[PDB]
Amino acid sequence: AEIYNKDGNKVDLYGCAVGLHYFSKGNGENSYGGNGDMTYARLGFKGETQINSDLTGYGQWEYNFQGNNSEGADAQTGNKTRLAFAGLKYADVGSFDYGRNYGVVYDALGYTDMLPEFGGDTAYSDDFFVGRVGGVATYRNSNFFGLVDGLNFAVQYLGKNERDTARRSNGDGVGGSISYEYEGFGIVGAYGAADRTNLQEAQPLGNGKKAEQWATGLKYDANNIYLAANYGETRNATPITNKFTNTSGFANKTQDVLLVAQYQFDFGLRPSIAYTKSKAKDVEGIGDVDLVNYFEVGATYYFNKNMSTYVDYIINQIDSDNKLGVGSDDTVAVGIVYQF
Amino acid sequence: AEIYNKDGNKVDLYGCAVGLHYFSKGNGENSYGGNGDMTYARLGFKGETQINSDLTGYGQWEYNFQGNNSEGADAQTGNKTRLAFAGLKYADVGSFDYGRNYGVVYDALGYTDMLPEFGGDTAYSDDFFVGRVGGVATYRNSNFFGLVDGLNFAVQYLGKNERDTARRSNGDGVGGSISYEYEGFGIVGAYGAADRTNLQEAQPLGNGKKAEQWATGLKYDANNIYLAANYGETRNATPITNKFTNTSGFANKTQDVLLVAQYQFDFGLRPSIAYTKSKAKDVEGIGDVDLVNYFEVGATYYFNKNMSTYVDYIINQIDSDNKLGVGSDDTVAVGIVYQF
Amino acid sequence: AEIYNKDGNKVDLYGCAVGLHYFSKGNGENSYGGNGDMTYARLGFKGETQINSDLTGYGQWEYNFQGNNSEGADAQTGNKTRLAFAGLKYADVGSFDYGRNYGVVYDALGYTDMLPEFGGDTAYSDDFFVGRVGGVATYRNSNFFGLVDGLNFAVQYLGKNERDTARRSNGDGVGGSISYEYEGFGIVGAYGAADRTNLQEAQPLGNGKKAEQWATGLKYDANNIYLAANYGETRNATPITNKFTNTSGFANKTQDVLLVAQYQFDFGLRPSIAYTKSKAKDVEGIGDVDLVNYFEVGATYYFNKNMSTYVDYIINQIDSDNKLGVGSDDTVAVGIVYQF
């Protein structure tokens, strides 16, 4: 909600309360999404200032607060700054922002990140370009310098984050993307390569001096319809865990496919049919292994901009015989949302 | 403070800064409330939306920020989401909300949780129903479907939270409550039973396949007077610690009594006289043990809705000879509050 | 930004997004400021209420959110409440506030804490009086009871914080300060003494039953000019680490000197020339050791109250041969700020 606007500075303070539960049999140690309470809160600010006519300065910070911890010691778990950045919109020339942000690859995969609860499984955190990373300078251009309508690109720069964990680390990298949006239709291309950290390289799973993530996208956003498809391929790039031998690291190569079909009904209900499969070719010890394999049945009922309840249900195509030992049970997710 | 209201959505953003100190002799390792700096901050949102005339959607998130940590490593301690939920108010039919929230039992014990600083000692966090728990679906009804004025109930559903700690865990449970409020007078009844987690059952202290919490309440809220009484009984339900043998778990049974007397003076000062005693019958190794035993002398001076300073002083009726080894010294608490 | 004002209560909700990077060679394990992503967010409230004409109640809470963590486990690092307090402004008689706050000494050292990114190196957290501490009651007086224009003092009371760490701990103490501000010119005096905690005393580095911090200040705030000088001396007061023998504690004595020269250009750019040197006399094992020794070249470009980018560059006068083993390389800092 816009809670400030004077002298050309406008500040939006927004949040939500998403009382949420997940439903699976057993512990759900072996289901897709887990089992039990999953409630969370968000709060953040989109700020924006006009420096002149030709110039606009902005900044954003969003934070995940978890509602499923006891007020004791586990009190802090899964709390995080999801976004924190700042930039300058120059008239027609462009827009530059540094901070923690979505990587250029997400300019593509984002398409199929539209399910009520789940979906967007290839969009990992601190996975170079496919999700939200820290230390990303991005230059984005709208309408090719204002000359070609709906033709947009972005060129991104990733800054070596050497962390205590290989999963969360990353080296120096570069990336880009181009999307063209002719009349409800949008097709996206996106690519990023990165140096790997020496800790990532001294992993058991994964082999290369370089991680790579590229994805193509297609969508139809019109007439209350959402159709979207995604094809991606990660090289030494997606993170994985042998749950049997308790081993960690990266998949040498992945081919990933995500498809979403959604229609928005007038009265509110937004039914959702989707599919997601990621598979890792040539993993060490195991060969070819599925990570994510499921069909999606779900419906968000919107009451207005602020209120909604959703049912999201992942029919898991993973068989119990999983070689990386992923979950094979189904996960039903039910939620009630107040956003502002 | 209400910081947004347009198009039928109203958002309240509220917080406080409570510079607070506690006063006890020695380390106060043996006093009632501790000793030293106790300053904290709160921030949260009560949001509310009108879906139509007959329908209202809401959500809340409140967060405890601690002010007594050094900016180093201890920086995060005692930080927590206290509330995070969402629900639907249907006209006269009712109101349903899931999330982290106060348990139905608190519909009773709440009465005597009115002291400036202390009091409400039987209202534990993640203690099933007596305080704030995670994963509670609640259906509350006002005025018995709008037919009997001031006659209210609630039926609650608790969702198995299997956690790393027995103190913080809990299984599947159900609860309810009825309160009737005839002219300043209010009498409450409240009951909840729950399955226990296998970790809770493999505790040294406590024995049963089930925890139980019921409490009765009475109050007089009128003429600047607050009188309230509470009688409760927890079965395998209240948590406790043998500080001698460093043992943990639950009291087999507790009888708990809380009484508050308060008058509000015109100019501002709200003097407060109160008493609280919890005792655990049939604890393992120890027999009958007092947990909380004290008298309360205190006064909140209110300047307005936003400003206040309070003195709260707990004369501790625990004798030094305590068999669970509780604190026996008095604790003086002084505070200065800016809320909004 | 002021987001609430009705019925005499005014509430400011303010924050920022500071996408920030630091530039150093090697790991920068040996540079002045580190190397890599350094983005952070802040959010807090300055609230204020009028109790009558003669009386004003206030409260503040500010919080540091870090933007450079992966969304995993390192997710929480360097998060902290920086301020959390409350107080009463009585007409001409004065103003009293308890909570977590800047210590009276900071009433002096504050002067040279004006660099774009760095500077103010002697202003440590939970270092008694020189920075932000927890459990400080402060009485501040403006214009000597409204009788001598621009003549101000403060008398402060520090409350024993016995913590898990000596670095972060502190005992019972008292402090004060007087500053007089004749026409752009301001000269400050400030002093504080404190009992030391037994854990601090059982440190290898440092010797005394008492820590002391006093600092003098001078400034010229006029005509778009900022000149300021600081002289300080800490006794058993500044914290330090032998990185060779991995030893911790306090410098027996420090003399500290900070100087800032800044001019504000009309169009926006604020160039900044500065210097900072702290040295510890009579440290155990080592003798005399420099802690901070550098020159400061930098420029904040302001677009308006909300937008800015800065370059800050510390030419490090520490030679590689450091006896406490401090960093000796230079650190370039680049940042982009949205505040509100």
Ligand SMILES: *CC(=O)Nc1ccc2c(c1)OCCOCCOc1ccccc1OCCOCCO2
């Ligand atoms: C206030 C608020 O946050 N409301 C809200 C409700 C339901 C939502 C979202 C917001 O979307 C953001 C979800 O945050 C998860 C990060 O986004 C993401 C990244 C990678 C893969 C999948 C992701 O989204 C999950 C589902 O988002 C769709 C709607 O969920």
Ligand SMILES: *CC(=O)Nc1ccc2c(c1)OCCOCCOc1ccccc1OCCOCCO2
């Ligand atoms: C902004 C703000 O929080 N102001 C404030 C000042 C003084 C208060 C309260 C709020 O009440 C909420 C206190 O939070 C503790 C949770 O409530 C609770 C649970 C169980 C037992 C006792 C409890 O309250 C402690 C005292 O509350 C009375 C007024 O305190």
Ligand SMILES: *CC(=O)Nc1ccc2c(c1)OCCOCCOc1ccccc1OCCOCCO2
């Ligand atoms: C919204 C926001 O916080 N904006 C902002 C941008 C740049 C800044 C500051 C704020 O100043 C506050 C910096 O916080 C650090 C605490 O202050 C401090 C203490 C001790 C020594 C040095 C300090 O300041 C560092 C630089 O501050 C100057 C401007 O930085």
